[PDB]
Design a protein around this ligand. Structure first.
Ligand SMILES: Cc1cc2nc3c(=O)[nH]c(=O)nc-3n(C[C@H](O)[C@H](O)[C@H](O)COP(=O)(O)OP(=O)(O)OC[C@H]3O[C@@H](n4cnc5c(N)ncnc54)[C@@H](O)[C@H]3O)c2cc1C
Ligand SMILES: NC(=O)c1ccc[n+]([C@@H]2O[C@H](COP(=O)([O-])OP(=O)(O)OC[C@H]3O[C@@H](n4cnc5c(N)ncnc54)[C@H](OP(=O)(O)O)[C@@H]3O)[C@@H](O)[C@H]2O)c1
Length: 374
């Protein structure tokens, strides 16, 4: 019923309409609010879905790599059977911004780096090297000749990055919006960044071309049912889909109660989309909002601490049939929010541990505990 030309292979050639820094002038983060125009295409998506974004590497990063190897583009290389100049394969077809244990160990072996060979066969050193030294600086630090084919052989194909959608088409129309944290760091003074997030944030697009597709997520959806209470836990860039949810519930005039738990380092710099949350609260759509600012005062505070502190009202909402949503960092945040939810269930339901556990699992079976963590 909704088939669509357009997918990860065959993406829509869309364009960039807004690229706006959303963190204040003293934040440590660079977060962009992006809006991509979907023209005529009819690309459709629902709150909860994600936008797949094809990206190109930075041409100044390819150039730095090409030059440290003594090559230029000129060098023909084979990518999936077609013959291309090396700087095109590097800009469009291969990953340059993520280093791995495997790429280090292979590059070490291949070039016989005098300086990286001591890492070969040592997992912990390899992962540590990779986790701190991007490809381009591994080559700076270990000069060695590499043909263009041996260079391409070593790299991993480029793949699109997924960004939770931050808009509802009922509000925005033929537009998609996304909330991108831009990965930025430096090695000795050389500015480095995430391939896709820095592409969106700094390069291709000027107001300008982007290749996109929808990654549907039927396991991350508002209640069909405008009256069911929703609980939303999305710190940092995890707030995206919750901006999709609220655009939807405001446009549909759903009367259901909505609660947002949000968190980030500083109230005055990292309150993503702060004046929307104020208008939502003012219009009656956002019922409750709890905020955790980790760096504003000494003791570190996170959304899990706020869940714990609102346990009793959380338990009352859960008992009113609330849906619970978690979005954001899978590594520590998802796990710490889970435990806090288990502790709220145990303490305000009457149960302790295994029963709290069965209770959350029943909520998930049942589709009242949905997560999009990454
Ligand atoms: C379903 C889903 C939804 C998502 N939603 C969002 C979203 O709403 N917003 C969002 O921002 N992201 C989201 N992401 C994550 C996003 O897809 C990306 O993985 C993220 O944008 C990073 O991609 P990148 O291309 O910019 O960087 P990459 O190029 O993939 O790289 C990150 C890296 O930089 C290096 N690195 C970083 N810092 C340093 C340092 N100091 N020292 C040396 N090495 C370092 C690399 O080795 C690795 O660490 C989502 C992911 C998924 C799967
Ligand atoms: O940088 P989301 O960032 O950098 O926000 C945590 C917020 C974080 N954070 C990391 N662990 C988290 C957790 N367990 N729950 C929620 N947010 C988490 C923080 O950085 P901090 O450690 O900045 O201060 C900070 O508020």
């Amino acid at each position: 019923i909704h088939t669509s030309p357009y997918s990860k292979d065959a993406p829509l050639v869309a364009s960039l309409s807004v690229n706006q820094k959303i963190t204040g002038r003293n934040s440590e983060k660079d977060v962009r609010h992006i809006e991509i125009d979907l023209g005529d295409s009819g690309l459709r998506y629902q709150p909860g879905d994600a936008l797949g974004v094809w990206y190109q590497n930075d041409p100044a990063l390819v150039k730095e790599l090409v030059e440290l190897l003594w090559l230029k583009g000129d060098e023909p290389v084979t990518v999936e059977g077609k013959t291309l100049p090396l700087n095109e394969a590097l800009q469009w077809h291969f990953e340059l911004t993520v280093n791995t244990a495997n790429i280090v160990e292979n590059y070490a072996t291949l070039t016989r780096s005098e300086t990286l060979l001591p890492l070969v066969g040592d997992k912990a050193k390899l992962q540590h090297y990779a986790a701190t030294t991007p490809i381009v600086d591994m080559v700076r630090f270990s000069p060695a000749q590499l043909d263009a084919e041996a260079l391409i052989n070593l790299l991993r194909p480029l793949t699109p990055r997924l960004y939770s959608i931050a808009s509802s088409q009922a509000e925005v129309e033929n537009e998609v919006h996304v909330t991108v944290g831009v990965v930025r760091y430096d090695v000795e003074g050389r500015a480095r960044a995430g391939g896709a997030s820095s592409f969106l944030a700094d390069r291709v697009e000027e107001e300008g071309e982007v290749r996109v597709f929808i990654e549907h997520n039927d396991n991350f959806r508002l209640p069909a049912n405008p009256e069911t209470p929703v609980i939303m836990i999305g710190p940092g860039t995890g707030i995206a889909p919750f901006r999709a949810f609220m655009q939807q519930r405001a446009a549909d005039e759903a009367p259901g109660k909505n609660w947002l738990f949000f968190g980030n380092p500083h109230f005055t710099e990292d309150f993503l989309y702060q004046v929307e949350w104020q208008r939502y609260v003012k219009e009656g759509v956002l019922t409750r909002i709890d905020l955790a600012w980790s760096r504003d005062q000494k003791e570190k505070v996170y959304v899990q601490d706020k869940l714990r502190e609102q346990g009793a009202e959380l338990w009352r909402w859960i008992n009113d049939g609330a849906h619970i949503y978690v979005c954001g960092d899978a590594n520590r945040m998802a796990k710490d929010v889970e435990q806090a939810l288990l502790e709220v269930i145990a303490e305000f339901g009457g149960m302790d541990t295994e029963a709290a556990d069965e209770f959350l699992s029943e909520l998930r079976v049942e589709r009242r505990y949905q997560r999009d963590v990454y």
